[PDB]
Design an enzyme around this catalytic site. Structure first.
Site, PDB file in Angstrom:
ATOM      1  N   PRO A 207       0.844  -1.224   0.161  1.00 58.80           N
ATOM      2  CA  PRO A 207       0.001   0.036   0.049  1.00 58.80           C
ATOM      3  C   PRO A 207       0.718   1.251   0.064  1.00 58.80           C
ATOM      4  CG  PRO A 207      -0.283  -1.291   1.901  1.00 58.80           C
ATOM      5  CD  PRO A 207       0.307  -2.028   0.881  1.00 58.80           C
ATOM      6  N   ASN A 208       0.318   2.174  -0.536  1.00 56.82           N
ATOM      7  CA  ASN A 208       0.898   3.458  -0.875  1.00 56.82           C
ATOM      8  C   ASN A 208       2.222   3.927  -1.556  1.00 56.82           C
ATOM      9  OD1 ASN A 208      -1.250   4.805   1.069  1.00 56.82           O
ATOM     10  ND2 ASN A 208      -0.495   3.082   2.297  1.00 56.82           N
TER      11      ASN A 208
ATOM     12  N   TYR B 295      12.955   8.354   1.344  1.00 57.00           N
ATOM     13  CA  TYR B 295      12.412   7.425   0.299  1.00 57.00           C
ATOM     14  C   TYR B 295      13.333   7.561  -1.150  1.00 57.00           C
ATOM     15  CZ  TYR B 295       8.814   6.051   3.686  1.00 57.00           C
ATOM     16  OH  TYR B 295       8.197   5.436   4.636  1.00 57.00           O
TER      17      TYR B 295
ATOM     18  N   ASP C 297       1.582 -15.942   5.592  1.00 53.69           N
ATOM     19  CA  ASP C 297       1.128 -17.328   5.299  1.00 53.69           C
ATOM     20  C   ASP C 297       0.881 -17.402   3.815  1.00 53.69           C
ATOM     21  OD1 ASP C 297       0.138 -17.988   7.820  1.00 53.69           O
ATOM     22  OD2 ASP C 297      -1.911 -17.725   7.422  1.00 53.69           O
TER      23      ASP C 297
ATOM     24  N   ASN D  41       8.102  -5.803  -1.362  1.00 51.35           N
ATOM     25  CA  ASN D  41       8.091  -4.605  -0.309  1.00 51.35           C
ATOM     26  C   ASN D  41       6.531  -4.284   0.004  1.00 51.35           C
ATOM     27  OD1 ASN D  41       7.937  -2.217   1.097  1.00 51.35           O
ATOM     28  ND2 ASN D  41       9.040  -1.039  -0.296  1.00 51.35           N
TER      29      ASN D  41
ATOM     30  N   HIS E  52       3.994  -5.014   8.779  1.00 51.26           N
ATOM     31  CA  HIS E  52       3.981  -5.002  10.093  1.00 51.26           C
ATOM     32  C   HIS E  52       2.355  -5.795  10.560  1.00 51.26           C
ATOM     33  CE1 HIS E  52       7.145  -2.295   9.416  1.00 51.26           C
ATOM     34  NE2 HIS E  52       6.274  -1.469   8.679  1.00 51.26           N
TER      35      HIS E  52
ATOM     36  N   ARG F  99       6.830  12.511  -1.958  1.00 50.35           N
ATOM     37  CA  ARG F  99       7.045  13.338  -0.755  1.00 50.35           C
ATOM     38  C   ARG F  99       8.339  12.584   0.104  1.00 50.35           C
ATOM     39  NH1 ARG F  99       4.860  10.893   3.903  1.00 50.35           N
ATOM     40  NH2 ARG F  99       4.655  12.993   4.621  1.00 50.35           N
TER      41      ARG F  99
ATOM     42  N   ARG G 142       7.260  -0.080  13.575  1.00 54.21           N
ATOM     43  CA  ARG G 142       7.700  -0.518  12.313  1.00 54.21           C
ATOM     44  C   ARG G 142       8.741  -1.362  12.512  1.00 54.21           C
ATOM     45  NH1 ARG G 142       4.974   2.846   8.780  1.00 54.21           N
ATOM     46  NH2 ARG G 142       3.869   4.663   9.712  1.00 54.21           N
TER      47      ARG G 142
ATOM     48  N   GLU H  39      12.589  -9.777   0.774  1.00 56.41           N
ATOM     49  CA  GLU H  39      11.729  -8.546   1.462  1.00 56.41           C
ATOM     50  C   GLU H  39      12.657  -7.327   1.371  1.00 56.41           C
ATOM     51  OE1 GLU H  39       9.480  -7.144   5.708  1.00 56.41           O
ATOM     52  OE2 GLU H  39      10.705  -8.861   5.631  1.00 56.41           O
TER      53      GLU H  39
ATOM     54  N   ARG I 284      13.020   3.910  12.588  1.00 60.33           N
ATOM     55  CA  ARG I 284      11.656   4.545  12.549  1.00 60.33           C
ATOM     56  C   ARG I 284      10.894   4.215  13.855  1.00 60.33           C
ATOM     57  NH1 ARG I 284       9.089   4.320   7.116  1.00 60.33           N
ATOM     58  NH2 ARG I 284       8.043   6.125   7.941  1.00 60.33           N
TER      59      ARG I 284
ATOM     60  N   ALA J 180       3.024  -1.153   4.490  1.00 55.27           N
ATOM     61  CA  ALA J 180       2.403  -1.339   5.683  1.00 55.27           C
ATOM     62  C   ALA J 180       2.055  -2.855   6.268  1.00 55.27           C
ATOM     63  CB  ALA J 180       1.165  -0.453   5.751  1.00 55.27           C
TER      64      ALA J 180
ATOM     65  N   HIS K 165      12.492  -3.061   2.214  1.00 56.06           N
ATOM     66  CA  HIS K 165      12.114  -1.821   2.686  1.00 56.06           C
ATOM     67  C   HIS K 165      13.068  -0.697   2.360  1.00 56.06           C
ATOM     68  CE1 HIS K 165       9.163  -3.969   4.998  1.00 56.06           C
ATOM     69  NE2 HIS K 165      10.464  -4.904   5.425  1.00 56.06           N
ATOM     70  N   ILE K 166      12.805   0.231   1.587  1.00 54.76           N
ATOM     71  CA  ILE K 166      13.598   1.365   0.955  1.00 54.76           C
ATOM     72  C   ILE K 166      14.019   2.030   2.247  1.00 54.76           C
ATOM     73  CG2 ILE K 166      12.961   3.656   0.067  1.00 54.76           C
ATOM     74  CD1 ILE K 166      10.785   2.255  -1.529  1.00 54.76           C
ATOM     75  N   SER K 167      13.315   2.344   3.241  1.00 52.90           N
ATOM     76  CA  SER K 167      13.669   3.040   4.261  1.00 52.90           C
ATOM     77  C   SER K 167      14.280   1.999   5.350  1.00 52.90           C
ATOM     78  CB  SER K 167      12.602   3.933   5.002  1.00 52.90           C
ATOM     79  OG  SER K 167      11.443   3.025   5.839  1.00 52.90           O
TER      80      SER K 167
HETATM   81  O1  LIG Z   1      10.368   1.794   3.791  1.00 52.88           O
HETATM   82  C1  LIG Z   1       9.597   1.125   3.106  1.00 52.88           C
HETATM   83  O2  LIG Z   1       9.813   0.638   2.024  1.00 52.88           O
HETATM   84  C2  LIG Z   1       8.230   0.846   3.863  1.00 52.88           C
HETATM   85  O3  LIG Z   1       8.040  -0.371   3.855  1.00 52.88           O
HETATM   86  C3  LIG Z   1       7.500   1.750   3.448  1.00 52.88           C
HETATM   87  C4  LIG Z   1       5.933   1.826   3.833  1.00 52.88           C
HETATM   88  C5  LIG Z   1       5.379   3.079   3.459  1.00 52.88           C
HETATM   89  C6  LIG Z   1       5.179   2.951   1.870  1.00 52.88           C
HETATM   90  C7  LIG Z   1       4.427   4.287   1.262  1.00 52.88           C
HETATM   91  O4  LIG Z   1       5.689   5.078   0.919  1.00 52.88           O
HETATM   92  C8  LIG Z   1       5.922   6.153   0.462  1.00 52.88           C
HETATM   93  C9  LIG Z   1       7.012   6.724   0.733  1.00 52.88           C
HETATM   94  C10 LIG Z   1       7.257   8.218   0.097  1.00 52.88           C
HETATM   95  C11 LIG Z   1       5.883   8.652  -0.539  1.00 52.88           C
HETATM   96  C12 LIG Z   1       4.582   7.947  -0.474  1.00 52.88           C
HETATM   97  C13 LIG Z   1       4.732   6.596   0.045  1.00 52.88           C
HETATM   98  C14 LIG Z   1       5.891   1.679   5.435  1.00 52.88           C
HETATM   99  O5  LIG Z   1       5.004   1.468   5.977  1.00 52.88           O
HETATM  100  C15 LIG Z   1       7.072   0.728   5.741  1.00 52.88           C
HETATM  101  O6  LIG Z   1       7.059   0.857   7.172  1.00 52.88           O
HETATM  102  C16 LIG Z   1       8.611   1.037   5.388  1.00 52.88           C
HETATM  103  O1  LIG Z   2      -5.289 -24.318  11.174  1.00 52.85           O
HETATM  104  C1  LIG Z   2      -5.983 -23.558  10.727  1.00 52.85           C
HETATM  105  O2  LIG Z   2      -7.242 -23.807  10.182  1.00 52.85           O
HETATM  106  C2  LIG Z   2      -5.674 -21.821  10.309  1.00 52.85           C
HETATM  107  O3  LIG Z   2      -6.971 -21.321  10.311  1.00 52.85           O
HETATM  108  C3  LIG Z   2      -4.966 -21.956   9.116  1.00 52.85           C
HETATM  109  C4  LIG Z   2      -4.238 -20.617   8.622  1.00 52.85           C
HETATM  110  C5  LIG Z   2      -3.608 -20.952   7.382  1.00 52.85           C
HETATM  111  C6  LIG Z   2      -4.622 -21.036   6.238  1.00 52.85           C
HETATM  112  C7  LIG Z   2      -3.731 -21.921   5.051  1.00 52.85           C
HETATM  113  O4  LIG Z   2      -3.648 -23.196   5.310  1.00 52.85           O
HETATM  114  C8  LIG Z   2      -3.060 -24.009   4.435  1.00 52.85           C
HETATM  115  C9  LIG Z   2      -2.825 -25.420   4.984  1.00 52.85           C
HETATM  116  C10 LIG Z   2      -2.316 -26.268   3.884  1.00 52.85           C
HETATM  117  C11 LIG Z   2      -2.159 -25.918   2.350  1.00 52.85           C
HETATM  118  C12 LIG Z   2      -2.201 -24.672   2.405  1.00 52.85           C
HETATM  119  C13 LIG Z   2      -2.995 -23.687   3.122  1.00 52.85           C
HETATM  120  C14 LIG Z   2      -3.121 -20.225   9.914  1.00 52.85           C
HETATM  121  O5  LIG Z   2      -3.174 -18.731   9.309  1.00 52.85           O
HETATM  122  C15 LIG Z   2      -3.873 -20.026  11.082  1.00 52.85           C
HETATM  123  O6  LIG Z   2      -2.816 -19.559  12.150  1.00 52.85           O
HETATM  124  C16 LIG Z   2      -4.653 -21.550  11.522  1.00 52.85           C
END
Ligand SMILES: O=C(O)[C@]1(O)C[C@H](CCCOc2ccccc2)[C@@H](O)[C@H](O)C1
Ligand SMILES: O=C(O)[C@]1(O)C[C@H](CCCOc2ccccc2)[C@@H](O)[C@H](O)C1
Ligand SMILES: O=C(O)[C@]1(O)C[C@H](CCCOc2ccccc2)[C@@H](O)[C@H](O)C1
Ligand SMILES: O=C(O)[C@]1(O)C[C@H](CCCOc2ccccc2)[C@@H](O)[C@H](O)C1
Ligand SMILES: O=C(O)[C@]1(O)C[C@H](CCCOc2ccccc2)[C@@H](O)[C@H](O)C1
Ligand SMILES: O=C(O)[C@]1(O)C[C@H](CCCOc2ccccc2)[C@@H](O)[C@H](O)C1
Ligand SMILES: O=C(O)[C@]1(O)C[C@H](CCCOc2ccccc2)[C@@H](O)[C@H](O)C1
Ligand SMILES: O=C(O)[C@]1(O)C[C@H](CCCOc2ccccc2)[C@@H](O)[C@H](O)C1
Ligand SMILES: O=C(O)[C@]1(O)C[C@H](CCCOc2ccccc2)[C@@H](O)[C@H](O)C1
Ligand SMILES: O=C(O)[C@]1(O)C[C@H](CCCOc2ccccc2)[C@@H](O)[C@H](O)C1
Ligand SMILES: O=C(O)[C@]1(O)C[C@H](CCCOc2ccccc2)[C@@H](O)[C@H](O)C1
Lengths: 149, 149, 149, 149, 149, 149, 149, 149, 149, 149, 149, 149
Positions: free
Chosen positions: K14-15, K27, K91, K78, K84, K22, K116, K103, K112, K81, K105-107
């Site tokens: 998202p976002n 970022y 899953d 990435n 977190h 900004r 986060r 995975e 932070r 949000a 993350h830019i920042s």
């Molecule tokens: O630093 C990252 O890549 C993050 O995944 C960015 C997320 C936020 C994405 C939105 O980022 C923007 C940055 C500048 C302008 C617009 C959106 C933030 O929730 C994570 O805590 C860290």
């Molecule tokens: O044990 C359960 O039924 C859960 O609701 C299943 C979730 C995961 C659903 C996906 O499960 C799969 C199982 C086998 C193969 C593919 C997906 C897990 O996030 C919960 O902590 C417990």
């Protein structure tokens, strides 16, 4: 063991001897004897029998689990208050290698006081049934029948 | 009291009756009787004797600690699950003014589930031995021999 | 039940059989038998009688609470260590609908180790008296006398 | 490696060079030199020898652990304050695949300040001995002898 | 000082001036005036007198404790909200070396909101009475009379 | 509504579309289509029918609970990952005044990672079944039949 | 020892060798040599001398504390980062029975990142001065001069 | 304002009126009047004057901080118990833009009970002196003299 | 500095000398010398060179950071265990105003023990790479190249 | 009481007398006199009046709440710092059965230091307005006007 | 799958559609299209291609991970949000047996807000790159190329 | 944008579509359409207009927030359950540089379940209004009209 050759142990912890005598909104109006009857019926429905017991003593419960370990095909246990406090009962169930164990709570503990939310027994019990009323004991039997199959 | 004049009480808590029957990688393949035999030998080596007991009942362990307080030269105790839960056993040991107490765990509880890391008994035990296998009991006896003389 | 018709149950938990024998700066030098005598007189001063018991066993205390629920006019309980660990005793007291319950601690547990600060029993006990010495038991009896009339 | 072929490394962490000079109620009146002599005797009683060392420097202890990993039959370690702070010493012991390791604390750290209750080293040490005075080191050597043969 | 030579200071904290005007299922329907009369009577029954005061000001209560320290035979205090927040009142009580102090709560705070479970005053009060209604003030007086004689 | 008049809504949350394709030791080797077939059979065995759905989207699940609220006799819900995260689904189920709701987890979430132990849905679900495999869905259907019928 | 007969040891922990090279709004513009000059001046004003040292090595600081124990009339210590991490330096100060120790922090650590708020060294230091700039070392010297006479 | 043109406000919080009367091993045998005299001379030694005040009332202390904000060259404050509780005094000091503020504790609060370890006032005070006895007030004057000159 | 004019400092924390010799599933079977060689080629591929070092000593690492601050174009650091415990190294890297700093962990610390999840170094490092194997060092070098360009 | 028959009490806690003299980016440039004027205006727009007061003393605020309980049609209160600390003010407000109460904070406390996030007053206040500037007081008047009619 | 036979999925949460508009000091000033171009280039340099996507919807990200599982050679994600909050995305990733996941993350999230600092995604991602700006996507691609080979 | 030039976006989170249908004592008896009509009249009362929307989908709310960022003069948002869980909605609001935002909760979340006490949205919302009923929407609109002014 199979249902055909050995009973399912149904163990009930402290205070459950008074089931039915108060808080029906939470626990129903059935007595412990009514619960026993339900379990007999449910086991018979699947070709088995039960050995239904209650105690207020943690050590007695431990002893009875050691007995189940050698002599019964599975355990359905409502550990009551000891759910929250007894590592001894957890360790007793841990010694039951290979035996199906289902924990039952009549009330939905998750909706009650915070200390009630956790159970040591849940760390070993194969399945855990909470808040299904005394029908949960039936589900316990049904699950053992399925596993000791 | 000296080792010459009174036995060392060795107390074992819940589930240790089944020692040797499972999880040998963690607890060994010795039985509780084999442990008793080790303790008898260790104590003899130092000119003492043992009174070796096991119970799944918290209250019986308390009773037995009150007996040791009057009649024994020390206590070596593996409180088992009750290590983690029993303030009553801590309090019992606290009544044993001047008596050497050594707490023993066969497994290293610090490598296990987080709830097993803490022990009430360690708050009073003079010494605590964990993860030395059943040899830990021999260390318990050896310590009590050093302290009771 | 009134004081006139039934005794007050006075329950004492683990280790209190040894009251008087150590730590008099904290617990006083009266024995548990002295305490029983104090309670007998306190109850009499209000037209009542007592049924004074002590046990190291959590299950037995539960069993006794269930007896009082049917046969006594109130409970004065010093649950001792079980104050801090026993949900089972809290649950047993909770079945005593309408019955006056006063929890008593000889020592002021709020000045002791952090684990001693909390009591499950205080969640149900109507009154909690702590740190008033054995006189606290007299206050328990005086409270029941006020409530059971 | 066996006791026959290679020494037991006995390692002592910071401040233990001053052992014997204060707090005899807690740590005894023996000096570190007296402890080294006790360990030499204890190892000889089992057909072994020791390499006994002390340092105030975390990194030097890590260096010595790497030396033991290749040249010694086991490690008895009193990490002293580093027990509570050193992930590096833990990680160093983790490199000692298959090597017996026993952690020793002269004092019963469970009776002391809260930060002293936890030990990183305990997460790898096979056995942990606390509150047995300088005899703990003897038990450490006995354990290593039992394991290294 | 003795009961015969100086009054018991009875201190009541904030909002207690409105006692009796609401929540009678929790606090009863006696007014603070009624509570004062109960204290006068209880003290007279043991050959003493009281000095009964109430304030909504933390610093006034501190001032009054300093007065009691010099002029009174003891303190019964219901600190009300300040029980949960006031280190200053705790410090003042701590200055009262040798003076008996009983803390009273009308309601059983352990059954109320979590922030109400803890009291700073209970770290100094010799005795703590909770949930005995306004009769808890009578226990306070009875306890001071016991200690100050 | 009764079972005779309206279907049971059976809701499945994210990722359960791949059930059967991995981790059979935990989740079994039934596919979600197999589970649907079991539910249809279970409902029929109690005179009811099912409306079985799966979505990866939290707000679609909320929409479907609003639909159940008006059109179905009960909800059996395995919220999957949203069990641990979704206050929105808890709020949605809260609007279902009087409707029976059973939450089901195939795995015993109490034996898994700590974040998995808590479920917002359990704060409303009447009953919670965990660790009974796909049979837990059958128990949910059985419970709804008991509550609705 | 007195100021007249032995120097005050002034110990500075890691990174303080770069003082004055950055963050002057926090730490000032004086260099560590300017700080040493301030200490020399302060001690002389009180008839004493100083032995001023800096190190990035925890074990070296331990070794220097052992030297001070035997050779100096007191310790002023800015442990820098090791304030927050070093139980080993705390334990070393603890060996300094009877020796005046003052801890100094240039910045007010209570205004910074939460991990900086705590100091192990403050558990032994007689006095702790934070946020008084490099004048804190002067206050150190003044305190030692008061105590060591 | 400078030292030459306005007094340093020295504020003392609750119970310090009784300094000197007890616990001399912690707080010394000087009275608060003795400390006022120490402060008068320490300020004069730097060409300043003091306005020394004590109160048991949090709001009065806030009122006096407002007065200092406008009329004084700095604040030396020992907030006593309010250190640990008073966000109101922290907010009051926060209004004193550009005014030097030094917090003083006679005792080393970091060696006392855990709730004493934290101070809200430290979040604004420029400097914090603890465990330097009443000499800490002198250091506070010395610091203000350095900043306000 | 630029890559052209100065080497990249590549610092490696405790135990990394033994890379390759165990746990290849987590850390790979490359040795530290192999990583050095990888680094040299990665830097050359961007026109730079490296100064590659490893130490078990926290203080030495601090000293080496101070060297890099004056003499190198950036720092790639795998602080190893000290990532989790060393405020001292954080503070050293904080002195490196304007110098690019990248932290590297071979293993994904977020999948390991809870204490490994946190790093002090990450509070200053511009970038943190974890779980990319020894390729992570290459990314470090690539990042420094980007930033110092 | 209606707005027509009694004033709205507007209570302001500690330090708000200084509003507008600093931190305008957070609290605006209006003074507390300007805030009073805005309340007079808002109340008049709705046919009512205000009784606008400020105090630094927690006990005075409690006194004024008791006055309002009997004499005013509602309470708008900005408790300032006591929001975070005063269970006494919460208790005062709790005595105002049926009286409308709106809590106002000029700043958005949720974006400030963690201790500021929580308010005891919000447990009673019917409505809570934060971060709407001084306009928050007009909203509190508008809400009283809606509720008191 | 190999890079030659299938695209790398690059998922953005998202976002991130507003990247560049900004906070450039955190970022950068590159837009998300610029990031896509960087990923296209980096994949091409290793003989591969990318499938670049962005969504504000958690369920749509789950859908797309399922697609990747069957059709793509790896995932660079990435989660923004949802890092977190989303156990559902964790899953989803867990179903991708054998697939390389990185995975990004830019920042540097560790610098932070505390919320986060934690990512559910990191519990499954093979590698996690944080704080390396948009170049971290290039590292992601480079890592997948290395692992898919 | 001004109120004159563009609508205020009023966004409602999950389940609010059912407003009015249950729990009137907490949420009132108005429906969401009645709220919309109230907002229309409030905005018109200040020369503005509204764009009123509701969704159960987190991603849709984020998309709507991005639309508002470009096209609307402010945002009034009742995020409902997503208040407590959605960092994604926080991050979207964070992109709305300069835009006024007011958070509204019809119920006073501080008097409800502990998890409901916290809102991510309040970390960005300029103003937060809770427990003012649907009139809180009017306060939102009134605040926007003041700020856009
Ligand atoms: O630093 C990252 O890549 C993050 O995944 C960015 C997320 C936020 C994405 C939105 O980022 C923007 C940055 C500048 C302008 C617009 C959106 C933030 O929730 C994570 O805590 C860290
Ligand atoms: O044990 C359960 O039924 C859960 O609701 C299943 C979730 C995961 C659903 C996906 O499960 C799969 C199982 C086998 C193969 C593919 C997906 C897990 O996030 C919960 O902590 C417990
Ligand atoms: O709900 C359950 O089954 C429990 O296991 C019952 C326990 C209570 C045992 C007594 O149950 C009675 C219920 C009604 C009347 C008498 C006893 C309680 O401690 C657990 O938290 C939940
Ligand atoms: O390691 C120990 O000695 C324990 O005290 C044993 C307890 C378990 C007693 C049951 O032990 C058995 C071991 C093998 C076979 C059967 C029982 C455990 O709860 C403590 O945490 C540690
Ligand atoms: O103060 C009390 O009455 C206690 O209930 C006593 C318990 C201990 C019972 C043993 O008491 C003795 C006292 C003197 C001599 C022997 C035992 C203790 O565990 C609670 O924390 C508080
Ligand atoms: O009890 C132990 O052996 C300790 O490892 C000792 C350490 C302290 C080492 C210094 O010991 C001395 C003992 C006596 C005299 C001088 C130093 C302490 O940090 C640990 O918490 C437990
Ligand atoms: O239960 C008690 O006595 C309390 O000390 C009373 C305080 C409340 C004082 C106000 O009491 C009133 C009671 C009834 C009517 C009016 C005021 C409360 O804050 C404590 O948590 C417990
Ligand atoms: O404020 C202090 O004195 C500190 O002890 C200094 C340490 C920092 C030592 C490095 O100090 C420098 C200051 C300026 C320039 C270079 C280093 C720090 O870790 C403590 O939290 C507080
Ligand atoms: O994963 C990493 O690179 C670490 O920085 C490595 C450290 C362990 C250093 C020793 O690494 C070895 C790996 C294999 C063989 C020998 C040493 C560990 O403390 C951190 O938690 C993560
Ligand atoms: O934002 C508010 O209205 C507060 O209630 C004000 C308090 C601070 C009172 C002093 O406010 C001033 C503002 C400007 C100038 C002087 C004081 C603070 O303790 C609460 O956390 C929030
Ligand atoms: O008080 C509020 O406005 C809430 O934001 C409403 C949410 C509940 C949304 C559904 O509300 C309904 C209310 C009445 C009837 C139907 C739904 C709740 O999750 C927040 O904690 C507080």
């Amino acid at each position: 063991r199979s249902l055909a050759n050995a009973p399912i142990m149904i163990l009930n912890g402290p205070n459950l001897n008074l089931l039915g005598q108060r808080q029906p909104e939470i626990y129903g109006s059935d007595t412990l004897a009514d619960v026993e009857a339900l379990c007999v019926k449910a086991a018979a429905a699947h070709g088995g029998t039960v050995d239904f017991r209650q105690s207020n003593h943690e050590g007695e419960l431990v002893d009875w689990i050691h007995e189940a370990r050698l002599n019964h095909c599975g355990i359905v246990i409502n550990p009551a208050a000891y759910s929250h406090t007894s590592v001894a009962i957890l360790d007793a169930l841990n010694t039951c290698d290979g035996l199906p164990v289902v924990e039952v709570h009549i009330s939905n503990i998750h909706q009650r006081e915070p200390f009630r939310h956790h159970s040591y027994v849940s760390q070993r019990a194969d399945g855990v049934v909470a808040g299904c009323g005394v029908q949960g004991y039936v589900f316990g039997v049904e699950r053992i029948a399925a596993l000791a199959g």
